[PDB]
Design a protein around this ligand. Structure first.
Ligand SMILES: N[C@@H](CC(=O)O)C(=O)O
Ligand code: NA
Ligand code: NA
Ligand code: NA
Length: 415
């Protein structure tokens, strides 16, 4: 009865209820001097949610990359394909840069200080560039999976899928039969892990409630100030991206901006209430039918840019890195900021596109800068911004969908 009714309730609405309750409980308990009780009674619930998220990282990465690499067997570059790919990367790269400016004009987390364990954060010297590049190739494919190395796993997974499609269409019947069996076994593992992800998200409202309550109880009132600044900074950057970038480009080629906004309102509203680019993809394709765009051209750009042209996610990754860096009390050099731009844009493609996937890929750019998740101080900062992702997930989704439609219009105008 009670357990059943908890199941069919919307997950996005369920998470919002937990976040609101967590903030209210944390402030009340912290004000009465009960911050010690929450650290020993509700914190384990938050830690369990973090541990569950880390388990799904590797089996998804290895299985999905092998299937994806073997899926795209042909290598064809159309005349209109190069036009849309170069636009996608340029917008993604500039979106990160705009987020850096917003992350610098407003300080996300300069005021807050983290002293977990009584030891301040100490940065470590980065390895030489030559050594980093050579570590991509693994000396043991099984060792990389067991030792928790992500970069060697990606390189081996991609080449394994490419090797499969070469012998999948060979002249030997026995070789062909073995190729399908191996691919099907790997494909089944990828599908199974997606089901576990759905079950994990049902526990998210409990996990988010514990994380928010623990943060607010130990330190509150003031912490809301930094959380408001980072939330406003992302939205300010996103609304600037829509107006300063897309509107200017449309005016250059003569597209009427007011007509585009009125015609694309259905796609923008659908993305906000769903927060899934893949889920709102049928809506986006329906809108393009009335635009006068040729059938062939838009049917290739919108599916392609759905998981590759997420401009809002790239801006979110750049801003969130500065908030964590300021929280630890360290500073980012000019060389490190350029590194973030390269890492952030790559993480944009790697994001699956499902709600909450952007926060998962945020750890990737943190390791490149020099902020491993194994550090307890870094883990506390990451887990604190992890809870508030639901508020900042909807805003960047609309920007992701908006960039897809305007890219097709520009390339279609110039054929
Ligand atoms: N909100 C993103 C997904 C994500 O950020 O993980 C999208 O809908 O494209
Ligand atoms: Na882009
Ligand atoms: Na997109
Ligand atoms: Na992506």
């Amino acid at each position: 009865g009670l357990y059943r009714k908890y199941i069919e309730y919307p997950v996005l609405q369920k998470i919002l209820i937990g976040l609101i309750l967590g903030a209210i409980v944390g402030l009340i308990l912290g004000h009465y001097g009960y911050a010690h009780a929450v650290h020993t009674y509700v914190k384990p619930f938050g830690d369990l949610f973090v541990r569950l998220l880390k388990m799904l990282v590797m089996p998804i990465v290895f299985a999905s990359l092998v299937v994806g690499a073997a899926s795209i067997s042909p290598a064809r570059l159309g005349r209109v394909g190069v036009k849309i790919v170069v636009y996608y990367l340029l917008t993604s790269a500039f979106a990160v840069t705009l987020g850096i400016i917003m992350a610098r004009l407003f300080n996300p987390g300069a005021g807050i200080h983290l002293a977990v364990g009584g030891q301040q954060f100490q940065p470590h010297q980065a390895p030489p560039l030559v050594h980093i590049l050579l570590d991509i190739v693994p000396t043991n494919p099984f060792g990389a999976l067991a030792n928790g190395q992500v970069l060697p796993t990606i390189f081996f997974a991609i080449i394994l899928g490419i090797a499969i499609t070469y012998l999948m269409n060979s002249e030997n019947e026995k070789v062909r039969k073995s190729a399908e069996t191996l691919l099907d076994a790997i494909n089944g593992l990828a599908e199974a892990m997606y089901k576990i992800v759905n079950g994990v998200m049902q526990y998210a409202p409990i996990g988010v409630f514990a994380l928010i309550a623990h943060v607010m109880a130990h330190q509150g009132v003031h912490v809301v100030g930094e959380l408001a600044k980072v939330t406003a900074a992302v939205y300010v950057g996103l609304t600037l991206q829509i107006l300063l970038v897309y509107f200017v480009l449309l005016k250059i080629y003569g597209i009427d901006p007011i007509s585009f906004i009125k015609h694309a309102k259905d796609a923008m509203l659908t993305a906000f209430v769903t927060s899934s680019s893949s889920g709102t993809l049928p809506v986006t394709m329906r809108v393009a039918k009335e635009m006068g765009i040729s059938e062939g051209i838009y049917s290739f750009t919108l599916p392609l840019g759905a998981t590759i042209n997420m401009d809002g996610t790239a801006l979110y990754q750049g801003v969130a890195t500065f908030f964590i860096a300021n929280a630890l009390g360290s500073h980012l050099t000019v060389g490190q900021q350029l590194t973030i731009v390269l890492t952030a844009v790559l993480a944009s493609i790697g994001t699956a596109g499902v709600p909450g996937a952007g926060a998962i890929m945020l750890a990737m750019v943190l390791h490149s800068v020099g902020l491993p998740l194994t550090d307890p101080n870094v883990a506390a900062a990451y887990a604190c911004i992890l809870g508030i992702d639901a508020i900042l997930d909807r805003g960047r989704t609309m920007v992701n969908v908006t960039g897809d439609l305007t890219g097709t219009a520009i390339v279609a105008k110039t054929e």
